């Protein structure tokens, strides 16, 4: 798009290449996403245009704002509000001291408000990860790449129902991913760092126990469930996320329920006692 000047490659994500750009008209600095070029053959599917157009209306302070959608030269460009840092870089920068618990809590609470909004509109993220969570100097955290999955790789934050081949998975998949991110902020280590789908599944089973019909009715009927799966016993949360307090552990336990129907919703998670003393601290950001 001739109305923009590329400043730097922000990165090469899942939906193409992302650039920091300046809008030659308004002077605004934005994030520009080129949705497929070497893979894109035709002139963008009609149903993809309509789903992206619906996303431009999904406006919330905890969602990276989609400013514009440019369908020109039969290619697709998404213009997003720009944020200077992501949670992965912030966690890497904070690994020696750890993110202070009040900021972890503020980030978790805001992302749960973001998810509550999306979920009320029947919109799922489906691929939540530290790299997709954008932060600013004012203490805000925002969901980026929201709803792009139905419009058109790291397995660490994948819900078990996805790994077991459930085709019609729900909003509970985002709650699972956010619980994994919560555990990671607390411990300064990924909860389930799998490098294959089976390794991902087996790491979940080693910590939370191999699921069965007792904890998850219908699990043995899942597409990729195998009766030959090894049977591991569950481990206590006190071993999984020390030194997280009991309110935090209780909330995490509910975000990591096997059964998607028992997993806490974003709305109910916001009422959890863990957020009784939530505040909005400001991070130490070196840009």
Ligand X SMILES: C[C@H](C(=O)Nc1ncc(SCc2ncc(C(C)(C)C)o2)s1)c1ccccc1
* Residue positions annotated with a catalytic role: 127
Identified binder of ligand X from the candidate list 77, 86, 123, 169, rule CB under 6 A:
86
Which 105-164 residues touch ligand X, going by CB under 6 A?
Answer: 131-132, 134, 144-145
Identified binder of ligand X from the candidate list 4, 82, 176, 229, rule CB under 6 A:
82
Rounded least distance, CB 282 to ligand X, Å: 18
**Segment contacting ligand X (CB under 6 A): 11-19, 193-201, 209-217, 267-275?**
11-19
Q: Does 193 bind ligand X (CB under 6 A)?
A: no
Looking at the Cβ atoms of 79 and 164, the one nearer to ligand X is 79
Any idea which residue has 């555990």 for tokens?
Answer: 183
To the question of whether residue 110 is assigned a binding role by annotation, the answer is no
Question: Edge-to-edge strand order for the sheet containing 29-35?
Answer: 4-12, 17-23, 29-35, 75-81, 66-72
Rounded least distance, CB 129 to ligand X, Å: 8
How far is 31 from 23, CA to CA, in rounded Å?
A: 10
Q: Does 207 bind ligand X (CB under 6 A)?
A: no
Identified binder of ligand X from the candidate list 21, 52, 64, 162, rule CB under 6 A:
64
Torsion of Cα atoms, 262 then 268 then 273 then 274, to 10°: 80
Binding residues for ligand X, rule: CB under 6 A, are: 10-11, 13, 18, 20, 31, 33, 64, 80, 82-86, 131-132, 134, 144-145
């Amino acid at each position: 798009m001739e109305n923009f000047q590329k400043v730097e490659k922000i990165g090469e994500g899942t939906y193409g290449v992302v650039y920091k750009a300046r809008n030659k008209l308004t002077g605004e600095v934005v994030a520009l996403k080129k949705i497929r070029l070497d893979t894109e053959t035709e002139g963008v599917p009609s149903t993809a245009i309509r789903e992206i157009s619906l996303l431009k209306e999904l406006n919330h302070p905890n969602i990276v704002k989609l400013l514009d959608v440019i369908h020109t030269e039969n290619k697709l460009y998404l213009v997003f509000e720009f944020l200077h840092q992501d949670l992965k870089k912030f966690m890497d920068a904070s690994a020696l001291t750890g993110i202070p618990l009040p900021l972890i809590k503020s980030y978790l609470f805001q992302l749960l408000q973001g998810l509550a909004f999306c979920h009320s509109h029947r919109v799922l993220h489906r691929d939540l990860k530290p790299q997709n969570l954008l932060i600013n100097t004012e203490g805000a955290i925002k969901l980026a790449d929201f709803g792009l999955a139905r419009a058109f790789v790291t397995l660490w934050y994948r819900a078990p129902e996805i790994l077991l081949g459930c085709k019609y998975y729900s909003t509970a998949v985002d709650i699972w991913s956010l619980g994994c991110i919560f555990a990671e902020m607390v411990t300064r280590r990924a909860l389930f760092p799998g490098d294959s789908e089976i390794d991902q599944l087996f790491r979940i089973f080693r910590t939370l126990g191999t699921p069965d019909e007792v904890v998850w009715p219908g699990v043995t009927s899942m597409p990729d469930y195998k009766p030959s799966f090894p049977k591991w016993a569950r481990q206590d949360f006190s071993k999984v996320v020390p030194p997280l307090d009991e309110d935090g552990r209780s909330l995490l336990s509910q975000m990591l329920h096997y059964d998607p129907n028992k997993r806490i919703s974003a709305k109910a998670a916001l009422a959890h006692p863990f957020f009784q003393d939530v505040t909005k601290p400001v991070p130490h950001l070196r840009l």
